[PDB]
Design a protein around this ligand. Structure first.
Ligand SMILES: Cc1cc2nc3c(=O)[nH]c(=O)nc-3n(C[C@H](O)[C@H](O)[C@H](O)COP(=O)(O)O)c2cc1C
Ligand SMILES: Cc1cc2nc3c(=O)[nH]c(=O)nc-3n(C[C@H](O)[C@H](O)[C@H](O)COP(=O)(O)O)c2cc1C
Lengths: 217, 217
């Protein structure tokens, strides 16, 4: 299957088959894929909650009650659920921890290259913190880029998924103590195999035409 | 090559081989991949500029001058460059045009299902416009999700890429009249084949460990 066929055949699963679980190899591949995502200045401004148990899924589904109840069964019936969380703030200590992990990983030949990268990344993060004043939105954008990798990657691995914004992030954040750890939930992605009765598995994919969305130069 | 190997082997290209051009089949596959991206409520709040000519690339590179000059040669030497643009605002007319494209595409059995989807999508877009007051950030997040699909997809198609935030979006917007058309440039992605002298092609990829970024439940 080509990556284009993966993009054409994936869809938002509206009903999972609660009997069908992902093999351990597919779960380990999902986790490696999202840890490896690109991010502006290698900020990696993310944390991931992975639920593989009925108790874990029930805890996440506390955030899909009332007006969000249409998403509850997607969480409960999926095999595995990934909660994508973004950093709520960014500071020099996080940037120094990041620079040290890259130094340990062999990215800097000398202290000159290391100091240079810090000064560059610092200039840039501070532009988002203090000049655009949008650092939380900028970090959540990197987390959405990560989600995109998972939606395409899941399809290429023949895994059904649905991205979910329709949840109460205060309830989910409190469920896992995320705000006191500097994180906030932004997207829920349940993973598994769609049920035969998934209405959306039998609808055509709808997108703007290429002549609408492309300007060629 | 598995999708995990695609995530492990891709990297941010810092120097392209200006002699090496993408085959027409690879360019058409990139364009189909990004048109097919998922987005919240199928908002597809995007437009794409694709430059395949020296003149096109020179026009985009006007936005990588002065403090952004470190990105100029990535644009000039790449085979093809994709500018990802987000909508600057969203209203009922865009939502009615979207609902009509989905109706034409066969997503609604009856006017009941159509009216239901409009009322649901409208409630939700209006929550971003008027309650969170973050509609432009919410739309740009969908465009970043799209970029993620391209970074992973390019790697699976054996195409080098680099995502670029380091550009002057006012200069790029004015270059293509985007703001008067309701769009703004958010990410530049040059595509092609890295040059042998790309320093970053010989550095290890650096990410947080799985024990840092995962909570298992
Ligand atoms: C949104 C975004 C914007 C980026 N902007 C730039 C840029 O302006 N110039 C640059 O050289 N690299 C840029 N990068 C590349 C990142 O530094 C890179 O993705 C990160 O260090 C992870 O390394 P990798 O892409 O080699 O795996 C950007 C990446 C992302 C995700
Ligand atoms: C950020 C994001 C959030 C989403 N939130 C929900 C949700 O809460 N519930 C839902 O059923 N679908 C949700 N979707 C699925 C979209 O409606 C779907 O991606 C879009 O209609 C395109 O269709 P496709 O994913 O079938 O190709 C979401 C998608 C994205 C990208």
């Amino acid at each position: 299957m080509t990556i284009v066929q993966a993009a054409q055949s994936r869809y938002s699963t509206k009903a999972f088959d609660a009997s069908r679980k992902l093999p351990e190899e597919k779960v380990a591949a999902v986790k490696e894929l999202i840890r490896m995502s690109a991010s502006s200045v290698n900020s990696q401004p993310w944390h991931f909650i992975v639920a593989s148990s009925e108790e874990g899924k029930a805890r996440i589904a506390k955030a899909t009650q009332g007006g969000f109840a249409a998403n509850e069964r997607k969480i409960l019936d999926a095999s595995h659920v990934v909660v994508f969380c973004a950093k709520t703030a960014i500071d020099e200590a996080y940037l120094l921890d990041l620079l040290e992990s890259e130094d340990k990983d062999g990215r800097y030949a000398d202290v000159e290259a290391k100091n240079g990268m810090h000064a560059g990344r610092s200039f840039f993060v501070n532009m988002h913190r203090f000049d655009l004043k949008d650092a939380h939105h900028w970090m959540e954008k990197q987390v959405y880029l990560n989600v995109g990798t998972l939606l395409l990657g899941a399809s290429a691995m023949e895994i059904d998924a649905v991205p979910i914004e329709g949840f109460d992030a205060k309830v989910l954040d409190e469920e896992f103590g995320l705000r006191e750890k500097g994180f906030t939930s932004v997207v829920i992605v349940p993973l598994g195999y769609h049920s035969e009765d998934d209405f959306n598995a039998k609808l055509p994919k709808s997108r703007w035409s290429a002549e609408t969305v492309f300007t060629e130069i």
